[PDB]
Structure 1
């Protein structure tokens, strides 16, 4: 099937991306998600860097399904193609003898959500706008490469040295060069509370559904890692969204910030802003403060 073909094609291919397993040393587990497991690691003589370099490594969990393996392969295939100061940087993979291991630049502070939840440490509204803005700039880049990310969320953004946002977790990202949508017949593996209404109901994913997600991400940022639609079970989200409900304005959120959230959550995809207008909106808020 499609996977066996990919596995075979792969297992027979770019020396630019091959790293020798014997120069990688694995360490403590940093995180496990629905698709893969990340460890801290160190790499010897990585891409012309002398000595060891501290890195992070993603790999399959115990008892991986074909689905999770398609996702790892595909994340690897997307990571090879993207370069941006605000997208996670790929160094290579070990693929030969042993499990597939993707090697990326280590992000000092880990996930944005963890970073926010551990805060009050003391962050200003200008910091929060700055964080959102860096992501929007990463997103406008991905939108111009004709990728839909699909999994935008505070847990899938990393925070590197000097509080730099790196967009992460490219396993669910799809190419939309041809038709400007990605459509998935069976049910998605993205959490329901981050999904655009037309992704929920109609399985349509676009840059405008990434915008919806960013809307939710903004709320996570503003609430310092709060839980979206708190107390509300995911199954209730069908009826809640279709009848035109959205999340209340949270505490410590301007009216201008909240209106941006709402414009990202418009029922009609075309009424939402594109990432370039989002970046302009955020620059304008930063400067006014």
Structure 2
């Protein structure tokens, strides 16, 4: 089938790293098919000595779907390069289990980073605007590469040295250089509360559904890692969404910031901002703060 082909094609040098030069450590978390461990790599792509890295692999009892996801992620990260997208350094596929060797972000996930925080780790509204803008810049680059990410959320943004945002989890990203949409027949594996109305109902993903998700991520940013649609079960979302409802303005959120969220959630995808406008809007908010 499609996977046996992918596994054989794959299994037969710029990305290949010797397993014996990688040392694995503690688990950092479980993703959308994968496990991420802290690791250290010896003589990694021209860096003399050990470099602290993160390693993505399969959990116990991995399914065909998870393995395809991991191979898919690996194939997207090869093509992708941007200071606000997680960096890929290699893979180990010859001696044992498939391991992806990626950039380590010192502060962990954005959700976790925000939930350890307060308002004024003491974070300003400028810091929160800054985070959202970096992410938006990363998204505009991916949108320019013709890639829908599909799984945009605070748990999938990492915080690197100097509080730099890194977009991660590319297991679910799709190529759209051709039809400008990715249409999935079976049911998706992206959390219900982060999905655009057309993705939920019609299984259509586009850069415009990434914008929807981004608007949900914005809400997470502004609430310091709050839980979207709190106390509302996912099954209620079909009806709540189609009848026009949206999360209300959260506390500690300017009128203009809430306007940007709502705009990302417009029912008609063509009336949502593109990432270039989002970056423009957030820039404009940053400079008027003073």
Pairwise same-fold verdict (TM > 0.5): yes
1:160-211 alpha-carbon deviations (Å, 9 max, x no partner):
0000000000000000000000000000000000000000000000000000
In the other structure, the counterpart of 1:94 is 92
Local SS of the residue matching 1:141 = helix
1:135-182 alpha-carbon deviations (Å, 9 max, x no partner):
000000000000000000000000000000000000000000000000
**CA distance in structure 1 between the aligned counterparts of 2:32 and 2:287, rounded to whole angstroms:** 39
1:101-138 alpha-carbon deviations (Å, 9 max, x no partner):
00011101010000000000100000000000000000
Local SS of the residue matching 1:28 = strand
In the other structure, the counterpart of 2:256 is 256
1:51-83 alpha-carbon deviations (Å, 9 max, x no partner):
000000000000000000000000000000000
**CA distance in structure 1 between the aligned counterparts of 2:49 and 2:145, rounded to whole angstroms:** 34
**CA distance in structure 2 between the aligned counterparts of 1:255 and 1:100, rounded to whole angstroms:** 48
Alignment map for 1:146-225 (pairs within 5 Å)? 146-225=146-225
- How far the C-alpha of 1:33 sits from its partner, in A, is 2.4
The one of 32, 35, 41 equivalent to 1:34 is: 32
Local SS of the residue matching 1:37 = strand
Local SS of the residue matching 1:188 = coil
- How far the C-alpha of 1:97 sits from its partner, in A, is 1.6
**CA distance in structure 1 between the aligned counterparts of 2:241 and 2:283, rounded to whole angstroms:** 29
| Contact persistence 2:32–2:171 (CA under 8 A) | no
**CA distance in structure 1 between the aligned counterparts of 2:83 and 2:184, rounded to whole angstroms:** 30
**CA distance in structure 2 between the aligned counterparts of 1:55 and 1:110, rounded to whole angstroms:** 12
Q: Which contiguous aligned blocks of 4+ residues in structure 1 show a shift greater than 6 angstroms?
A: none
**CA distance in structure 2 between the aligned counterparts of 1:34 and 1:255, rounded to whole angstroms:** 34
**CA distance in structure 2 between the aligned counterparts of 1:92 and 1:232, rounded to whole angstroms:** 41
1:213-235 alpha-carbon deviations (Å, 9 max, x no partner):
00000000000000000000000
- How far the C-alpha of 1:34 sits from its partner, in A, is 3.5
Larger deviation, residues 31-40 vs 256-265: 31-40
- How far the C-alpha of 1:264 sits from its partner, in A, is 0.0
**CA distance in structure 1 between the aligned counterparts of 2:143 and 2:54, rounded to whole angstroms:** 26
Local SS of the residue matching 1:43 = strand
Q: How many residues are matched?
A: 287
**CA distance in structure 1 between the aligned counterparts of 2:213 and 2:31, rounded to whole angstroms:** 19
Tell me the TM-score normalised to structure 1 length: 0.99
Local SS of the residue matching 1:59 = strand
**CA distance in structure 1 between the aligned counterparts of 2:83 and 2:32, rounded to whole angstroms:** 26
Local SS of the residue matching 1:75 = helix
- How far the C-alpha of 1:35 sits from its partner, in A, is 0.6
**CA distance in structure 2 between the aligned counterparts of 1:191 and 1:246, rounded to whole angstroms:** 16
1:10-53 alpha-carbon deviations (Å, 9 max, x no partner):
000xx110000000000000001231000000000000000000
Local SS of the residue matching 2:55 = strand
Gaps of 5+ in 2: none
Gaps of 5+ in 1: none
Tell me the TM-score normalised to structure 2 length: 0.99
In the other structure, the counterpart of 1:139 is 139
